[PDB]
Every structure is written in C-alpha cells, then in structure tokens.
Scaffold this motif. Structure first.
Motif, PDB file in Angstrom:
ATOM      1  N   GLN A   1       0.837  -1.191   0.000  1.00 27.81           N
ATOM      2  CA  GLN A   1       0.000   0.000   0.000  1.00 27.81           C
ATOM      3  C   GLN A   1       0.874   1.243   0.000  1.00 27.81           C
ATOM      4  O   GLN A   1       2.009   1.228   0.482  1.00 27.81           O
ATOM      5  CB  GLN A   1      -0.933   0.028   1.216  1.00 27.81           C
ATOM      6  CG  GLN A   1      -1.840  -1.189   1.341  1.00 27.81           C
ATOM      7  CD  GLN A   1      -3.298  -0.897   1.008  1.00 27.81           C
ATOM      8  OE1 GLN A   1      -3.827   0.183   1.314  1.00 27.81           O
ATOM      9  NE2 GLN A   1      -3.960  -1.870   0.384  1.00 27.81           N
ATOM     10  N   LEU A   2       0.345   2.321  -0.570  1.00 28.99           N
ATOM     11  CA  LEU A   2       1.054   3.588  -0.510  1.00 28.99           C
ATOM     12  C   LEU A   2       1.215   4.016   0.950  1.00 28.99           C
ATOM     13  O   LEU A   2       0.365   3.701   1.788  1.00 28.99           O
ATOM     14  CB  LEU A   2       0.294   4.654  -1.294  1.00 28.99           C
ATOM     15  CG  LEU A   2       0.390   4.603  -2.816  1.00 28.99           C
ATOM     16  CD1 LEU A   2      -0.491   5.661  -3.417  1.00 28.99           C
ATOM     17  CD2 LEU A   2       1.811   4.835  -3.227  1.00 28.99           C
ATOM     18  N   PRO A   3       2.294   4.724   1.290  1.00 28.76           N
ATOM     19  CA  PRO A   3       2.430   5.220   2.668  1.00 28.76           C
ATOM     20  C   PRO A   3       1.233   6.079   3.055  1.00 28.76           C
ATOM     21  O   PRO A   3       0.704   6.835   2.237  1.00 28.76           O
ATOM     22  CB  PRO A   3       3.725   6.037   2.632  1.00 28.76           C
ATOM     23  CG  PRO A   3       4.471   5.534   1.430  1.00 28.76           C
ATOM     24  CD  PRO A   3       3.412   5.158   0.434  1.00 28.76           C
TER      25      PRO A   3
ATOM     26  N   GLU B   1       0.816   8.690   4.650  1.00 28.18           N
ATOM     27  CA  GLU B   1       0.981  10.095   4.306  1.00 28.18           C
ATOM     28  C   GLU B   1       0.535  10.363   2.874  1.00 28.18           C
ATOM     29  O   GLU B   1      -0.219  11.308   2.610  1.00 28.18           O
ATOM     30  CB  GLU B   1       2.441  10.505   4.504  1.00 28.18           C
ATOM     31  CG  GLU B   1       2.885  11.650   3.610  1.00 28.18           C
ATOM     32  CD  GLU B   1       4.389  11.662   3.356  1.00 28.18           C
ATOM     33  OE1 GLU B   1       4.808  11.200   2.270  1.00 28.18           O
ATOM     34  OE2 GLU B   1       5.148  12.138   4.235  1.00 28.18           O
TER      35      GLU B   1
ATOM     36  N   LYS C   1      -1.475   8.555   0.970  1.00 24.32           N
ATOM     37  CA  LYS C   1      -2.920   8.393   0.875  1.00 24.32           C
ATOM     38  C   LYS C   1      -3.652   9.631   1.375  1.00 24.32           C
ATOM     39  O   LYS C   1      -4.718   9.977   0.850  1.00 24.32           O
ATOM     40  CB  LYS C   1      -3.379   7.166   1.661  1.00 24.32           C
ATOM     41  CG  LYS C   1      -2.618   5.901   1.358  1.00 24.32           C
ATOM     42  CD  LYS C   1      -3.056   4.778   2.284  1.00 24.32           C
ATOM     43  CE  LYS C   1      -4.241   4.027   1.708  1.00 24.32           C
ATOM     44  NZ  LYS C   1      -5.301   3.791   2.745  1.00 24.32           N
TER      45      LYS C   1
ATOM     46  N   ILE D   1      -3.431  12.452  -1.180  1.00 25.45           N
ATOM     47  CA  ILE D   1      -4.282  12.149  -2.326  1.00 25.45           C
ATOM     48  C   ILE D   1      -5.728  12.533  -2.031  1.00 25.45           C
ATOM     49  O   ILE D   1      -6.387  13.190  -2.845  1.00 25.45           O
ATOM     50  CB  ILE D   1      -4.162  10.659  -2.707  1.00 25.45           C
ATOM     51  CG1 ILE D   1      -2.859  10.386  -3.473  1.00 25.45           C
ATOM     52  CG2 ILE D   1      -5.394  10.190  -3.489  1.00 25.45           C
ATOM     53  CD1 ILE D   1      -2.593   8.909  -3.702  1.00 25.45           C
TER      54      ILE D   1
ATOM     55  N   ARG E   1      -7.906   6.793  -5.739  1.00 29.05           N
ATOM     56  CA  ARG E   1      -8.540   6.428  -4.470  1.00 29.05           C
ATOM     57  C   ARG E   1      -8.928   4.959  -4.415  1.00 29.05           C
ATOM     58  O   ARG E   1      -9.654   4.558  -3.504  1.00 29.05           O
ATOM     59  CB  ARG E   1      -9.810   7.253  -4.197  1.00 29.05           C
ATOM     60  CG  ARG E   1      -9.856   8.679  -4.678  1.00 29.05           C
ATOM     61  CD  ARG E   1     -11.299   9.055  -5.041  1.00 29.05           C
ATOM     62  NE  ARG E   1     -12.131   9.357  -3.875  1.00 29.05           N
ATOM     63  CZ  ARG E   1     -13.458   9.485  -3.908  1.00 29.05           C
ATOM     64  NH1 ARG E   1     -14.122   9.332  -5.048  1.00 29.05           N
ATOM     65  NH2 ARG E   1     -14.125   9.767  -2.799  1.00 29.05           N
TER      66      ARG E   1
ATOM     67  N   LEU F   1       6.140   7.879  -5.747  1.00 24.52           N
ATOM     68  CA  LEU F   1       4.883   7.516  -5.114  1.00 24.52           C
ATOM     69  C   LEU F   1       3.911   8.684  -5.055  1.00 24.52           C
ATOM     70  O   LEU F   1       2.716   8.467  -4.835  1.00 24.52           O
ATOM     71  CB  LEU F   1       5.133   6.966  -3.705  1.00 24.52           C
ATOM     72  CG  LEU F   1       6.018   5.712  -3.800  1.00 24.52           C
ATOM     73  CD1 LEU F   1       6.634   5.341  -2.475  1.00 24.52           C
ATOM     74  CD2 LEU F   1       5.349   4.526  -4.489  1.00 24.52           C
ATOM     75  N   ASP F   2       4.397   9.907  -5.248  1.00 20.94           N
ATOM     76  CA  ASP F   2       3.554  11.091  -5.330  1.00 20.94           C
ATOM     77  C   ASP F   2       3.062  11.367  -6.748  1.00 20.94           C
ATOM     78  O   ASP F   2       2.482  12.426  -6.985  1.00 20.94           O
ATOM     79  CB  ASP F   2       4.309  12.326  -4.801  1.00 20.94           C
ATOM     80  CG  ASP F   2       5.766  12.385  -5.282  1.00 20.94           C
ATOM     81  OD1 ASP F   2       6.188  11.541  -6.121  1.00 20.94           O
ATOM     82  OD2 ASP F   2       6.500  13.285  -4.816  1.00 20.94           O
TER      83      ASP F   2
ATOM     84  N   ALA G   1       0.603  10.094  -8.310  1.00 21.68           N
ATOM     85  CA  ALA G   1      -0.854  10.202  -8.317  1.00 21.68           C
ATOM     86  C   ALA G   1      -1.319  11.627  -8.008  1.00 21.68           C
ATOM     87  O   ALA G   1      -2.332  12.092  -8.550  1.00 21.68           O
ATOM     88  CB  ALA G   1      -1.456   9.218  -7.313  1.00 21.68           C
TER      89      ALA G   1
END
Lengths: 192, 192
Positions: free
Chosen positions: B5-7, B9, B11, B14, B61, B142-143, B145
């Motif tokens: 899963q994304l960290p 933070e 999430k 986002i 999401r 990872l940022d 998105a």
C-alpha cells in the motif's frame, strides 16, 4: 519526499538471491583464476560480463555505481554486446574443434548465453507501477529486483559453462592436431 | 506477493487533492445543470471530459473502472480527443462572435485546454520506479498520483471557463445580430 524503502520481506528475499548469485560468481572467479587472459578474449569478456553483473546485483542492495533503472538497462546492453563478442570468438573455437560432441556442447552453451542476455535485458527494466486493486491504490512490481538477480545468476552460470567448454574444445584441437598444427588455436589457454 | 500500500501520508495527500478536484468538478456540474445539451455538443463534450476525469481521480482512491496505468493512459487520450472536438466547435463559436474581447478570451481558454490535455497525458503515466539511493533500493515516484489529480483539476477548471466563455460569446452574437440572424448560432443555449 515521494520515496519509500522496499518492504523488509522484499529486502530479505533480495539478500537471499544475491547470495545464490554470489555462489555462481565464485565458480567463475575460480575458473578464470587459472588462466592468463593475454591472448584469450573469451576470459576477458567473461570477466567484463561478470563485473557488470556484479554492478547490477549491487544495485538491488543499494551498492555500486548504478543509481537508476536507466543505468541498469544500459548495463544489460553492455553485457549483451560483450556476450555477442564472446559468441563470435567461441563459435570460431567450436568450428576449429575436431570432436563433434564438444563442438555441439559449446555451440549449445552459446545459444544459452544469447537467451540469458535477452532475458537479462528484459529484467533490467526492474519495473514498478501503481494499480487500483482491492479498493486501494497500491504499488506493484516490488519483486522485480529478484527477477533481475536470478537472470544475472542464470547468465553467470551459462558463462561459466561456456568458458569451461571453450577450454575443453581447445584441448581437443591440440590433442588431435598437435601443438604443431599449421592453424593456431583461435584462443590460447596459458596457466598463471 | 509483490505489492504494498502507498504510505499513509501519501494516501492523505491524495484524498486532499481529490477534495480540491471535486470542488472544481462541482463548478462544472453547476454550470452544466442550467442547459439542455441537445443542440450543444460543447456541453456534451464537457460532461464526457468531466466523467473521464472522475474515473482518473477515482483510480487514485482505489475506485472506479480504471485498474492499471494502461487504463489511465487510455482515459487521458480519450479526454484529449474530446477536447480536440470541443476545440473545433468552440473555435467556430469564437469566429462567429462579434466582440473581439470575448472572442479573444474564448480562443485563449481553448489554448489552455490544449495545454492541460497535453499535461494530463504526461501525468497519466503515474510513474513509479526503483533506484539505488542512500545505500538502499527504494521505490520513488509515489507522489505521481498527486500530480495526476492536479492536472485533472487544472483541466476541469479550463473546461469550466471555456463553457462559460462559449456561452458569453454566443449571447454577444445574438445580442448584436438578433435571433433573426441569417446564420444560426454554431451552438444553442436552451434552459432546462
């Protein structure tokens, strides 16, 4: 920000595959240590292939001079070029070989080298990606580094076998046609 | 395995950008709700662009029909095609407009749409990658998105402005040349 460490499980599986790789690499070191690589470009190319494979596996451990996927892709292409050169030389060794079974062995190992250079090219992309799965945005492909290390291990093993079979094919030529053969061996095997 | 899963933070950042996006999307809904989109393809294309942008932001999401990066890239190309069609139609509205300042406004907003469709195409790759940094193999990008959501928000805003300026330019044509102009308005604005 924007970055995160691989899950500790993945870091463990990587150190495990790197150990297996290092054992195949030791086989190459032991084999190459016997010979003076002057007059034997098969040895030189094998050492070069080995050194670049070490850079690629070091990348997966956070070591060495490769910093990003682009460097790892370029390293794989350099390995493939060196394998192409080793292939042309070992083909001449096999052509010179008077034993059809040693010749066939050697040519078959060269096809293994070509296949494993191609597979290493594929794995050098070490792809990661995001996807919408299980109601979350997740990061996939985190095990891509493990496929890279195993592709390096496969290639290392084929290089080891090819170096050995090149030596065997050379000694068959000299055994049959003598050190006074009019055509000199394509490559020379002198002890160190 | 292979996924994570994304960290938390990331999430959070986002869900924050998605909220900002949703507020721009509400502006489009409010604007589009006034009109009967029969005889007005600018409205139809705006709704279609809006709906696909909702799929792209939902992807970040863990929602909606887009499952992977390839789907998100294809969604962006569909948005760009629709923007290209809206562009041709709104250009005809602007050409028909007798006020040079409303015409110029409208044409400038269309160039904004073209730029933001292109930037959304770039961001739809939502790239992740591994790199050798700080003595570790880490996952970067990872940022990505968040850049995707902001590009959608930028495009949503330009679509809202373009729809409004198309309406304004239309009313200038009718005000000047009357409902009995020999050439009918390129597009019709009928209340709902």
């Amino acid at each position: 920000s924007g970055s995160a460490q691989l899950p500790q499980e993945e870091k463990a599986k990587i150190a495990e595959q790197v150990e297996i790789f290092h054992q195949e690499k030791s086989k190459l070191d032991a084999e190459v240590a016997k010979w003076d690589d002057s007059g034997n470009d098969i040895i030189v190319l094998a050492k070069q292939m080995c050194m670049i494979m070490m850079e690629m596996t070091d990348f997966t451990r956070g070591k060495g001079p490769l910093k990003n996927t682009s460097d790892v892709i370029n390293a794989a292409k350099k390995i493939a070029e060196a394998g192409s050169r080793m292939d042309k030389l070992a083909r001449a060794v096999a052509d010179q070989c008077p034993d059809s079974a040693c010749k066939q062995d050697l040519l078959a190992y060269l096809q293994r080298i070509a296949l494993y250079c191609h597979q290493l090219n594929i794995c050098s992309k070490v792809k990661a990606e995001v996807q919408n799965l299980g109601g979350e945005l997740i990061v996939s492909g985190l095990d891509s580094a493990t496929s890279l290390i195993q592709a390096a291990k496969n290639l290392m093993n084929a290089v080891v076998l090819t170096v050995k079979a090149s030596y065997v094919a050379s000694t068959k030529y000299q055994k049959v046609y003598g050190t006074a053969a009019v055509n000199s061996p394509v490559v020379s095997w002198k002890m160190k």
